[PDB]
Design an enzyme around this catalytic site. Sequence first.
Site, mmCIF file in Angstrom:
data_model
loop_
_atom_site.group_PDB
_atom_site.id
_atom_site.type_symbol
_atom_site.label_atom_id
_atom_site.label_comp_id
_atom_site.label_asym_id
_atom_site.label_seq_id
_atom_site.Cartn_x
_atom_site.Cartn_y
_atom_site.Cartn_z
ATOM 1 N N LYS B 165 1.837 1.241 14.151
ATOM 2 C CA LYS B 165 2.746 1.812 12.994
ATOM 3 C C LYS B 165 3.444 2.971 13.571
ATOM 4 O O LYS B 165 2.947 3.650 14.254
ATOM 5 C CB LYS B 165 1.952 2.240 11.908
ATOM 6 C CG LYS B 165 2.768 3.079 10.920
ATOM 7 C CD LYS B 165 1.832 3.500 9.564
ATOM 8 C CE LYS B 165 2.453 4.796 8.684
ATOM 9 N NZ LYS B 165 1.745 5.083 7.547
ATOM 10 N N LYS B 167 6.301 5.763 12.813
ATOM 11 C CA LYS B 167 6.996 6.508 11.899
ATOM 12 C C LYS B 167 8.460 6.751 12.005
ATOM 13 O O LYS B 167 8.914 7.069 13.343
ATOM 14 C CB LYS B 167 6.340 7.971 11.800
ATOM 15 C CG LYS B 167 4.865 8.004 11.133
ATOM 16 C CD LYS B 167 4.101 9.330 11.455
ATOM 17 C CE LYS B 167 2.756 9.367 10.277
ATOM 18 N NZ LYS B 167 1.670 8.544 10.716
ATOM 19 N N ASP B 196 7.389 3.031 9.144
ATOM 20 C CA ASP B 196 7.263 3.715 7.854
ATOM 21 C C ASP B 196 7.978 4.975 7.843
ATOM 22 O O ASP B 196 8.162 5.799 8.799
ATOM 23 C CB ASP B 196 5.525 4.461 7.544
ATOM 24 C CG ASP B 196 5.440 4.993 6.439
ATOM 25 O OD1 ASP B 196 6.249 5.317 5.491
ATOM 26 O OD2 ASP B 196 4.269 5.444 6.098
ATOM 27 N N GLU B 222 7.004 -0.154 5.592
ATOM 28 C CA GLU B 222 6.176 0.687 4.593
ATOM 29 C C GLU B 222 7.115 1.754 4.013
ATOM 30 O O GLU B 222 7.932 2.264 4.717
ATOM 31 C CB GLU B 222 5.181 1.348 5.464
ATOM 32 C CG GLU B 222 4.096 2.228 4.447
ATOM 33 C CD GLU B 222 3.198 3.030 5.083
ATOM 34 O OE1 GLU B 222 2.735 2.832 6.145
ATOM 35 O OE2 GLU B 222 2.830 4.040 4.541
ATOM 36 N N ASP B 247 3.791 2.947 -0.904
ATOM 37 C CA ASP B 247 2.912 4.038 -0.440
ATOM 38 C C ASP B 247 3.276 5.137 -1.568
ATOM 39 O O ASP B 247 2.671 5.141 -2.537
ATOM 40 C CB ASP B 247 3.076 4.565 0.928
ATOM 41 C CG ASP B 247 1.936 5.797 1.069
ATOM 42 O OD1 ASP B 247 1.137 5.927 0.278
ATOM 43 O OD2 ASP B 247 2.239 6.427 2.485
ATOM 44 N N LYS B 271 -5.144 4.719 -1.040
ATOM 45 C CA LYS B 271 -5.745 5.774 -0.224
ATOM 46 C C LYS B 271 -6.553 6.518 -1.180
ATOM 47 O O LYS B 271 -6.056 6.854 -2.327
ATOM 48 C CB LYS B 271 -4.613 6.780 0.243
ATOM 49 C CG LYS B 271 -3.506 6.191 0.803
ATOM 50 C CD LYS B 271 -2.648 7.244 1.372
ATOM 51 C CE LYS B 271 -1.326 6.455 2.331
ATOM 52 N NZ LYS B 271 -0.539 7.551 2.964
ATOM 53 N N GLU B 325 -6.008 2.076 8.380
ATOM 54 C CA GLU B 325 -5.403 2.745 9.457
ATOM 55 C C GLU B 325 -6.021 3.998 9.382
ATOM 56 O O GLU B 325 -5.639 5.200 9.390
ATOM 57 C CB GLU B 325 -3.889 3.020 9.130
ATOM 58 C CG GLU B 325 -3.619 3.606 7.650
ATOM 59 C CD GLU B 325 -2.068 4.018 7.449
ATOM 60 O OE1 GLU B 325 -1.290 3.685 8.464
ATOM 61 O OE2 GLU B 325 -1.916 4.944 6.611
HETATM 62 MG MG LIG Z 1 2.749 6.047 4.361
#
Ligand SMILES: [Mg+2]
Lengths: 370, 370
Positions: B165, B167, B196, B222, B247, B271, B325
Site C-alpha cells: 500500500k 500513501k 491511500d 483507498e 476508510d 479497524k 494490514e
Molecule cells: Mg486509510
Amino acid sequence: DLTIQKVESRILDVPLIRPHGFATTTSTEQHILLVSVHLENGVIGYGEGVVPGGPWWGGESVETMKALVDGYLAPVLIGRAVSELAGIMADLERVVARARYAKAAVDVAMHDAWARSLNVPVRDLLGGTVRDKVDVTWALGVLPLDVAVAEIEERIEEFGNRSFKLKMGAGDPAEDTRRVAELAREVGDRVSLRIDINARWDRRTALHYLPILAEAGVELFEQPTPADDLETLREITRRTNVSVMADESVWTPAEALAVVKAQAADVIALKTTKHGGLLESKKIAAIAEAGGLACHGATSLEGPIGTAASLQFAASTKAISYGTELFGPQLLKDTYIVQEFEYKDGQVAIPQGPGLGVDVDMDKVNFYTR
Amino acid sequence: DLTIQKVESRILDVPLIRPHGFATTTSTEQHILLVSVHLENGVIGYGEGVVPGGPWWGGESVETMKALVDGYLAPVLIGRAVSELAGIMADLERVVARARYAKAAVDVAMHDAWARSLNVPVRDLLGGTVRDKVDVTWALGVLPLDVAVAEIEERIEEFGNRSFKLKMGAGDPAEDTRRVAELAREVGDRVSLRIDINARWDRRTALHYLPILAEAGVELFEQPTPADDLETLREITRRTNVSVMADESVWTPAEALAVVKAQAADVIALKTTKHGGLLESKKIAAIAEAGGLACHGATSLEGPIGTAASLQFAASTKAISYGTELFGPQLLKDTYIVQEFEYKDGQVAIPQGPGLGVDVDMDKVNFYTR
Ligand SMILES: [Mg+2]
Ligand SMILES: [Mg+2]
C-alpha cells in the site's frame, strides 16, 4: 478435550394446553428437534430445531431438519473443538445452503456446550449482560371473539402482560377484521394490541381492511402479506400510518438489509431459530440497529431450550428494543427442562446459570420422543 | 470479583524505525493511549486508544482520548462486573457521543480483562476461531520513487508481503501520480499495489489523476477523497473500474450502511479502534457482509496490544475477507509486550493464550509513558 465427539437429534412432540390456530393450520402440540452436542469432556449442549407448528410457515419441519442435521450438518462438527464455533458455522454453508432453522439448532447446541464447558451463561459468549429481564407480549392463536377477550382478561390478571398479539388469516377477511376490531374496542384501552396474519392476506385485501383495524386501535401489523413483497409492507404503513413488523420477510442479514433499503418496516421479528443461530441473530440486530429499525424478541414457539437460547440473546443484545414474545414454555402443557421460568408482571427473568441457564430432564425428553 | 475497581490510561510515545510520511504530516513516533481495566480478582486488561500519527486523521488524539477516558468513560465502569461489557458500552453513549477511538480502548481493555478471568483468548468471546493466521499488506509512507522501490523489494525478501500500500497526498498531485505510476511499472507485476490518499485530494483531482494509476495497474484506491463524499467514491470506480476502499468514510455501523446504499466502495477498512471496539467492529462486519462488501482488517497503526486485539477480531470474523494490514508493531523501534509477533511469508499468526494473547512488559510501558 473440548472436541465434539457426537451430535444427536431427537424429535419431540409436546402437547399444548389449548389448540393454537394459525391462518391455515391448527396445532395441538409443538414439534421440536432437540439437538445435542456431546463434548469429549462429557458436557452436553442443547439446541432446538423448531418452527411454528409445521412446514406451512417456511418450508422447514422437524422431519426436514433432522434429515439435514443428521445427514449433512452434524458430520461437519465431529472431531473439531466447540471453540471453533464461528468457523464451523461458516463451513456448514459449504454442505447445505439456506435451511437456517436446521442450522440454528447446531449453533445453539454448540454455544451451550461451550458456555457450560467454560462455566458461564451463554450470554457471556455474546457480549455479556445488558438486561436481566424482558417484557413479554402474549400471542393468541386464532380464537372466537368471546374466547379471545376472556383469555386476555385472564392473562392480564394472572401474568401481567401489557401487550397482546392476535393471529389472523383464517376464513373470511371481512369477518376476521370484525373479530379483531371488536376485540380492540373491549381491550385496546388497557393494552397494546398487535396482529399477525403470517403472510396469508394478499396486498389488495390488506390495504382494504387494515385501515379498519388501525381506526380500532391496533398498533402493529406483523407480516400481513407475502414475505417477498416489501413494497406492500411500506405501502400499508403509508396508507394507515401504523407500524409494520417483518417476520417471514426477514430470515437472513441480506433480507434485513433489503427491508432497510425498502423502508418496509419499523420493527423486525428477530428469532434465533429463524436466523440460523445466535451468530446470525447478532448480524440481524446490527443491520436493523444501523437502519434505525427496532428488533423484537420474537418466537417460533420454541420449547424451554429454544426460548432460553433466545433470552440469553435478548439479555446481551441492546438492539432488542421492542420487548419480546418469548412465552413458548407457557403454551406447552408440560416441559422437559427441570427448572421453571419466572413469568410475572408482564415479564420473564433471564435464566441465571451456566449454558442456557436451564438443564434438560432426560426422562421427560425420552417420554416425549417420537 | 469481576468488579471493575479501577481504570487507568497512560500516553505512550514509542519511536518508529523510520519516519512515516502521510499526506499532510510526517510521524517520527506513534502516540498510544494504553488503557487498563483493573478487576477485583487482580486481573488487568489492556486496550489501545490510538489514531494514525495524530488528530489530522479524524479529530481525536491521545490527549483528547485521555481527557474523555479519564474524565467520562472510566467512571461508568467502576463498580460494575466486566461481564456487563455490552451494557456498559451502551451506557457510555449517555455521557459521550461519538469519540469512537477513545471508546475502542475501553472496549478492548474490558474484553482482555474479561477473557483473562475466564482463562480464554479474546476471540473466544467473539465466536471462536475461523483462522489462525492472516495475510498482511505492507504500507509505505510517502517516499521518493527509489527509496520506495527499495523498501518493497526488501520487504518481499525479508517478510514476503505479497501486497503493498502506497500513501499519497503530499505536494503536487501530478508529480505524486507520476511517482506512484512509475513505481507500479517496476513492481506492479510481482505484487498487488494499492494507494491511500487519506481524503486529501478533492473530487476533481481524483477523477483526473486516478485513471493514470488505474492504467498503470493499481488495484485499489483507498479513501482518496473526503469522508463525506460517497458519490465521488462511487464515481471514481465508475470512470476507472478500479475498486475503492472506504476508510475515513466508515467509522460507525450507520456509516457502513450509507456506503452500502450508495454503492460507494467494494471494500471497507475495518479497524477495531476506529469503530469504537470489538462489539462495534462485529456490527461493521455484519453490515458489510450482508451487502456483499469485503472487509479488510485495517490498521490505525496500533501498537502490539491494539494489533493483538484486531488479530483476535480477524481470527473470529469470516467477514474479514480481504486480508489485513496489521503490521503496526513492525513499525515501532521497540515494543512493550514481552512476546513477539510471528511474521513470515507475507502473513502473521494469531497470538495464542488468554486475553489478547500478549502480555505487556510494564517496565517498557513505564519507559515510553509520557
Ligand atoms: Mg486509510
Ligand atoms: Mg409472525
